[PDB]
Amino acid sequence: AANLSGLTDAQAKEFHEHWKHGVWSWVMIASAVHVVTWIYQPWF
Amino acid sequence: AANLSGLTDAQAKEFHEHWKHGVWSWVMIASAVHVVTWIYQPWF
Amino acid sequence: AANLSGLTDAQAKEFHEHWKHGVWSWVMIASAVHVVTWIYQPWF
Amino acid sequence: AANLSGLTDAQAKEFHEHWKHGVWSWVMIASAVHVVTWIYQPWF
Amino acid sequence: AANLSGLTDAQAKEFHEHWKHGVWSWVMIASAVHVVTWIYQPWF
Amino acid sequence: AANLSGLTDAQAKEFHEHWKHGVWSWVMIASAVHVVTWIYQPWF
Amino acid sequence: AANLSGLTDAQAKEFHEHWKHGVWSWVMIASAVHVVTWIYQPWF
Amino acid sequence: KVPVMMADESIATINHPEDDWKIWTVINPATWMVPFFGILFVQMWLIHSYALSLPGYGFKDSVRVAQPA
Amino acid sequence: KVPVMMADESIATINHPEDDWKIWTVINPATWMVPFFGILFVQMWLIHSYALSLPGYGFKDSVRVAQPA
Amino acid sequence: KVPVMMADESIATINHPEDDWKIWTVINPATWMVPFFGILFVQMWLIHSYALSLPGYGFKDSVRVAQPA
Amino acid sequence: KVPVMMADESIATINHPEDDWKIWTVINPATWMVPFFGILFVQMWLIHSYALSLPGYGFKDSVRVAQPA
Amino acid sequence: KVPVMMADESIATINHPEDDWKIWTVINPATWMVPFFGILFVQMWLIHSYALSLPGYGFKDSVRVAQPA
Amino acid sequence: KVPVMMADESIATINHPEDDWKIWTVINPATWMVPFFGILFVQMWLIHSYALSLPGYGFKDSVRVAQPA
Amino acid sequence: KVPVMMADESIATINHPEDDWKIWTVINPATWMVPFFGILFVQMWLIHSYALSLPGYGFKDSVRVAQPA
Ligand code: BCL
Ligand code: BCL
Ligand code: BCL
Ligand SMILES: COC(C)(C)CCC(=O)/C(C)=C/C=C/C(C)=C/C=C/C(C)=C/C=C/C=C(C)/C=C/C=C(C)/C=C/c1ccc(C)c(C)c1C
Ligand SMILES: COC(C)(C)CCC(=O)/C(C)=C/C=C/C(C)=C/C=C/C(C)=C/C=C/C=C(C)/C=C/C=C(C)/C=C/c1ccc(C)c(C)c1C
Ligand SMILES: COC(C)(C)CCC(=O)/C(C)=C/C=C/C(C)=C/C=C/C(C)=C/C=C/C=C(C)/C=C/C=C(C)/C=C/c1ccc(C)c(C)c1C
Ligand SMILES: COC(C)(C)CCC(=O)/C(C)=C/C=C/C(C)=C/C=C/C(C)=C/C=C/C=C(C)/C=C/C=C(C)/C=C/c1ccc(C)c(C)c1C
Ligand SMILES: COC(C)(C)CCC(=O)/C(C)=C/C=C/C(C)=C/C=C/C(C)=C/C=C/C=C(C)/C=C/C=C(C)/C=C/c1ccc(C)c(C)c1C
Ligand SMILES: COC(C)(C)CCC(=O)/C(C)=C/C=C/C(C)=C/C=C/C(C)=C/C=C/C=C(C)/C=C/C=C(C)/C=C/c1ccc(C)c(C)c1C
Ligand SMILES: COC(C)(C)CCC(=O)/C(C)=C/C=C/C(C)=C/C=C/C(C)=C/C=C/C=C(C)/C=C/C=C(C)/C=C/c1ccc(C)c(C)c1C
Ligand SMILES: COC(C)(C)CCC(=O)/C(C)=C/C=C/C(C)=C/C=C/C(C)=C/C=C/C=C(C)/C=C/C=C(C)\C=C\c1ccc(C)c(C)c1C
Ligand SMILES: COC(C)(C)CCC(=O)/C(C)=C/C=C/C(C)=C/C=C/C(C)=C/C=C/C=C(C)/C=C/C=C(C)\C=C\c1ccc(C)c(C)c1C
Ligand SMILES: COC(C)(C)CCC(=O)/C(C)=C/C=C/C(C)=C/C=C/C(C)=C/C=C/C=C(C)/C=C/C=C(C)\C=C\c1ccc(C)c(C)c1C
C-alpha cells in the first residue's frame, strides 16, 4: 500500500531472495577463509 | 496534515513499531555481550 | 511567502518547539553527567 | 532573472541580512574568547 | 518489468558486457604488475 | 544548445567574471601572506 | 538511444574532446615536474 | 513524561516517551536510517578500537595460546 | 536581544532569541537534522577521545580493580 | 521468532526471521546497497588493519622467505 | 571596492563589499549552509586539536589542581 | 552454479555466474560506478600504504642509488 | 593557446585561456562550488598542518615569549 | 585495440581506445567530474604526503638555508 521504499511486496520478496543469496555466499566464503586462517594460526 | 517526512501518522506509528523492535533487539544482544565481557573481565 | 525551506511559519514554530525540547533535554542530561564527572575528578 | 540559486534578489538581500548577523555574532564571540585566552596566555 | 535501476534487461546486458571488459582489463594488468613485483621480491 | 550544466552561454560568461574575481582575490592575498612568511623565514 | 547519462552521442564525443584536452595537459605538466624532480633527486 | 524546558510555550505539550513515533513525521526512514545505520557502524568501530586497545581484550596478546591446528 | 552588527541595514530587525524558529524557514529539518545529528555524533566522538585521553577518566588504568566475575 | 520487546503494542506481530524481506519495503535497494557495500568495504579495511597488525598474519615479517624470482 | 583582476573584462563591475548578498543568487542557503556549518565544525575541531596540543592550554596538565569534589 | 543458500525458497533459481548482468537491474550505473570507482581508489590507496610500508618496496630506502641527474 | 593534445581530432579547437567560462556549461555552480570550497578548505587544512610542522612556523615554540597579559 | 576478455560474448565489439567518449554515455559529467576532481585531489594529497616524507624532498630539512629576508 504505497510502501516507503517504492517497492511492491512482490518486488521486496524477489529482491530478498537475491539478497539472501549474496549474504550466504559472503558468509560461507568468509567461514572457509576463517577455517584456513585458524589452521594457520588460531589467534586464541 | 502534510507531514514533513511525507509519512502519514499511521505510517509513522507502524514504522515506529518496527523501529522499537530493532532498537530493543540491539539493546538486549548488547546487554548479553556486555554481561559476558564483564564476567571475562570487568574493566572497572 | 514561499519560504526557502518549504516550511510555513506555523510549521516552523511547531518544529522549533520540538527542537527546543530536544536541545534542552540534551543540555540538562549533559549538565548532570558533567556534575558527576567533576565530583569524580574536576579536570581543573 | 532566473538566478542560479532559485532565489530572487529580494530573497538574497534578506538572507544576507540574516547571514551578516550570524557572521558578526560569531566573530564578536570569537574575539572575546581570544582576548580572554591571550590574557591567560599569549601564544606569542 | 519496471526494474529497480530503471534499466531494461537489454540495457543491463549491454552494460554488463562493458563492465566485464573493464573488470578483466583491470584484473589482467594487476596480474602482470603482481608477477613483476613477485620477481622483484616475493613478499612470502 | 541545452548545455550540460543547464546554464546558458551568457550565464556562463557572467559567472566566470565573478569566478575570476574570486580566484584573483584569493591568489593576491595568498601571495601577500607568502611574501610576509618568506620575510619572516624563507623555508628554502 | 536514451543513453544512461542523458547525453547524446554527439554531446559525448564533444565532451570527450574537452576531457582529453584536460587529461593531456595534466599528464604533460606532471611529466615536466617529474623530470625536474628527478634531476633534483632521482628517488631510485 | 513532561520535563520542564527552557522557554517552551505551552500550546503544544510534549509528553514524549509516548510521543515518539512522531519523529518519523519529520525523518523519512526511506531516505535516512541507512545513513543512521552507517553512524551506528562508525560508533561500533570506534568503541571497538577503544575496547580492543584496553588490556586483556581482543587478540593482541593471545595469538598462539592452545588447541592449535 | 538586538546586537550591533557590522554593516546591517536596519529595515529588518533581528531580535533573535525570540526570532529563532525562523531558521527553520531556511533549513528544512526533513532533509537536515539527521546530518546535523551526525555532526553531533562526530563532536561526541572527538570530545570523548580527548576526555578518555585525560588522566583518570575512562578505563585505561582500571581494567581489573575489584568485584570481578 | 517473536521476542519480547520493551513497550511493543501488539497489533502488529513481528515474527521476524520470516518477516525479513519486509525491510525492503522501507529500504529501496536501488538507492542503497551500494552505500551499504561501501560500509562493508570500510568494515573489511578496518578488520584487515587489525588482523594484519596481529603477530604472524600478513607479510610484515615474511617479505623474503624462499622460492624467490 | 574595485580591485584589479587579472583578465577581467569590464562590462560587469564588481565592487564587492557592497555586492555581497549576490553570492546568494548562486548559493541556495536552503541546500547549503548546513554543509557550510559542517565545514565550520571541522575547522573548529582542527583548530581545537592544534590549540589543545599547545603547552598550557586545555586540561592535559591540570586534571587535579584544587577545589575538588 | 547453484550453491545451497540458507533458507532460500526455490521459486527463483539463482545460477549466478550466468545471472550476473542482473545486478544492473538494481544498480543503475549512471548514478553509481563513479562512487564504486571511488571505493576502488580508496582500496588502491590503502593497499599501497600497506605495501609501501613493507621492507624493500617503494622508495623509502632508495632515494639516491645511481644514474643521477 | 592551443597546445598539442594526444589524439585530439580537430573539429573543435580548444584555445583555452580564452575558452574558460565554458567549464560552467558543464559544472553548474549552484550545485557545486560549495563542495569545491570544501575541497579548498581541506587543502588549506593540509597545507597548514604541513607548514605548522615545519621548524619556526606557528606557535609550538613561542607560547610564552613576551608582552604578556 | 580488441583485447581478449574472459567470457565476453561477441555481439558488441569493444575496440576501446577508439571507443572512449562512450563512457560519457553512462557517466554524466555535469553530475560527476567535480567528484572525480575531488578524487584526484585526494590522490594528489596522498602522493604528496608520501613524496614529502621521502628524504631530500620538500622543506623539512631546508627551512633556513640561504638568501634570507
Ligand atoms: C585553547 C584554549 C581554550 C579554547 C579557546 C577557544 C577560542 C580561542 C575560541 C573558542 C571557541 C569556541 N569554543 Mg573553545 N577553548 C577550549 C575548550 C573548549 C571546550 C572544552 C570541552 O574544553 C569546548 C566545549 C569549547 C567550545 C567552543 C565553542 C563553543 C566555540 C566555537 C564554536 C564555533 O566556532 O562555532 C562556529 C559556528 C558554527 C559551526 C555554526 C553554528 C553552530 C552552533 C549554533 C554554535 C553555537 C554556539 C556558538 C558560540 C554561537 C555563535 C553564534 C552564531 C550566531 C552561530 N572550547 C580551550 C580550553 N575556544 C571559538 C569561537 O568561535 O567562539 C565563538 C574561539 O574563538
Ligand atoms: C605557516 C605560517 C603561518 C601561516 C601562513 C599562511 C600562508 C603562507 C597562507 C596563509 C593563508 C591563510 N591563513 Mg595561515 N598561517 C599561519 C596561521 C594561521 C591561523 C592560525 C590559527 O594561526 C589562521 C586562522 C590562519 C588563516 C588563514 C586563512 C585566512 C588563509 C587561507 C584561506 C583560504 O585559502 O581560503 C581559500 C578560500 C576558500 C576555502 C573559499 C572561501 C572561504 C572564505 C570566504 C575565506 C575568507 C577569508 C579569505 C582570506 C578570503 C579570500 C578571498 C576570496 C574572495 C574568497 N593562518 C601560520 C602562523 N597562511 C593562505 C591564503 O590563501 O591566504 C589567502 C596563504 O597563502
Ligand atoms: C616531492 C617534490 C616536490 C613536488 C613534486 C611534484 C610532482 C612530481 C608533481 C607535482 C605536481 C603538483 N604539485 Mg607538487 N611538489 C612539491 C611541493 C608542492 C607544493 C608545496 C606547498 O610545496 C605545492 C603547492 C605543490 C603543488 C602541485 C600541484 C599544482 C600539482 C598537482 C595538481 C594536480 O595534479 O591536479 C590534478 C588535477 C585536478 C585535481 C583537477 C583540476 C584542479 C585545478 C584546476 C588544478 C590547477 C593546477 C594544475 C597544474 C592544472 C593542470 C591542468 C588541467 C587542465 C587541470 N607541490 C615538492 C616540493 N609536484 C604534480 C602534477 O600533476 O603537476 C601537474 C606532479 O606531477
Ligand atoms: C572492524 O574490526 C575491528 C573494529 C578491528 C573489530 C570489530 C569488528 O570486526 C566488528 C565490530 C565487526 C562487525 C561486523 C558486522 C556488524 C557485520 C555486519 C555484516 C552484514 C550485515 C553483512 C551483510 C552483507 C550482505 C551482502 C554481502 C549482500 C549481498 C547481496 C548481493 C550481492 C545481491 C546481489 C544481487 C545479484 C543479482 C541480482 C539480480 C540482484 C537483484 C541482486 C540484489
Ligand atoms: C566511541 O567510543 C568512545 C569514543 C571510545 C567512547 C564513547 C562512546 O562509546 C559513546 C560516546 C557512545 C555513544 C553512543 C550513543 C549515543 C549511542 C546511540 C545509539 C542509538 C540511538 C541507537 C539506535 C539504534 C537503533 C536501531 C538498531 C534500530 C533498528 C531498526 C530496525 C532494524 C528496523 C528494521 C525494520 C525491519 C522490518 C521492517 C518491516 C521495517 C519496517 C523495519 C523498519
Ligand atoms: C571536540 O572536542 C575537542 C576538539 C577535543 C575540544 C573542543 C570542543 O569540545 C568543542 C569545540 C566543542 C564544540 C561544541 C559545539 C559548538 C556544540 C554545539 C552543539 C549544538 C548546537 C547542539 C544542538 C543540539 C540539538 C539537539 C540535541 C536537538 C534535538 C532535537 C530533537 C531530538 C527533536 C526531535 C523531535 C521529536 C519529536 C517530534 C514530533 C519532532 C517534530 C522532533 C523534531
Ligand atoms: C585548522 O587550524 C589549523 C590547521 C591547525 C591552523 C590553520 C587555521 O586555523 C586556518 C587555516 C583557519 C582558517 C579559517 C577560515 C578560512 C575561516 C573562515 C570562516 C568563515 C568564512 C566563517 C563564516 C561564518 C558564518 C556564519 C557563522 C554564519 C551564520 C549565519 C547564521 C547563523 C544565520 C542564521 C539565520 C537565522 C535566522 C534566520 C531567520 C535566517 C534566515 C538565518 C539565515
Ligand atoms: C586494503 O589493503 C589492506 C587492508 C592493507 C589489506 C586487505 C586488502 O587488500 C583487501 C581486503 C582487499 C579487498 C579487495 C576487494 C574486495 C576488491 C574488490 C574488487 C572489485 C569488486 C573490483 C571491481 C572492478 C571493476 C572494474 C574495474 C570495472 C570497470 C568498468 C569499466 C571501466 C567500464 C567502462 C565502460 C567503458 C565504455 C562504455 C561504453 C561503457 C558502457 C562502460 C561501462
Ligand atoms: C596539502 O599540502 C601538502 C600535501 C602538504 C603539500 C602539497 C600541496 O600543497 C599541493 C599539492 C597543493 C595543491 C594545490 C592546488 C592544486 C590548488 C588549486 C587551487 C584552485 C584551483 C583554486 C581555486 C580557487 C577559486 C576561488 C577562490 C574562487 C572563488 C569564487 C568566488 C568567491 C565567487 C563568488 C561570487 C561572488 C558574488 C557573486 C555575485 C557571484 C556570482 C559569485 C560566483
Ligand atoms: C597515493 O600514492 C601512494 C599511495 C603513496 C602511492 C601509490 C600511487 O601514487 C597510486 C596508486 C596512484 C594511482 C594513480 C591513478 C590510478 C591515477 C589516475 C588518474 C586519472 C584517471 C586521471 C584523470 C585525469 C583527468 C583530467 C585531469 C581531466 C580534466 C578535464 C578537464 C579539465 C575538462 C574541462 C573542460 C574545460 C572546458 C570545457 C568547455 C569543457 C566542456 C570541459 C569538460
Ligand atoms: C530519531 O531516531 C534516531 C535518532 C534516528 C534513532 C533512534 C532514537 O532516536 C532513539 C533510540 C532515541 C532514544 C532517546 C532517548 C532515550 C531519550 C531520552 C531523553 C531524556 C531522558 C530526556 C530527559 C530530559 C530531562 C530534562 C529536560 C530535565 C530538565 C531538568 C531541569 C531542572 C530543567 C531546568 C530548567 C528548565 C527551565 C528553565 C527556564 C530553567 C531556568 C531551568 C534551570
Ligand atoms: C537491512 O539489511 C541491511 C542492514 C541493509 C543488511 C542486511 C541485514 O540486515 C542482515 C544480514 C541482517 C541480519 C540480522 C540479524 C542476524 C538479526 C538478528 C537479530 C536477533 C538475534 C535478535 C534478537 C532479539 C532478542 C530479544 C529482543 C530478546 C529479549 C530478551 C529479554 C529478556 C527482554 C526483556 C524485556 C522485555 C520487555 C520489557 C518490558 C522488559 C522490562 C524487559 C527486561
Ligand atoms: C555489482 O558489481 C559491483 C559490486 C558494483 C562491482 C562488480 C562486481 O560485483 C564483481 C566484479 C563481482 C564479483 C563477484 C564474485 C567473484 C563472486 C563470487 C561468488 C562466489 C564464489 C560465491 C560462492 C558461494 C558459495 C556458497 C554459497 C557455498 C555454500 C556451501 C555450503 C556448505 C552451504 C551450507 C549450508 C547451506 C544451507 C543450510 C540450510 C545450511 C545449514 C548450510 C550449512
Author numbering:
A (entry chain L), B (entry chain J), C (entry chain H), D (entry chain F), E (entry chain N), F (entry chain D), ...: 5 to 48
H (entry chain I), I (entry chain G), J (entry chain K), K (entry chain E), L (entry chain M), M (entry chain C), ...: 2 to 70
What text does the study give?
In purple bacterial photosynthesis, light energy absorbed by light-harvesting 2 (LH2) complex is transferred via the LH1 complex to the reaction center complex, where it is trapped by the primary charge separation reactions. All such complexes are formed by the circular oligomerization of dimer building blocks consisting of pairs of low–molecular weight, hydrophobic apoproteins to which bacteriochlorophyll (BChl) and carotenoid (Car) molecules are noncovalently bound. We report the 2.4 Ångström resolution structure of the light-harvesting 2 (LH2) complex from Marichromatium (Mch.) purpuratum determined by cryogenic electron microscopy. The structure contains a heptameric ring that is unique among all known LH2 structures, explaining the unusual spectroscopic properties of this bacterial antenna complex.
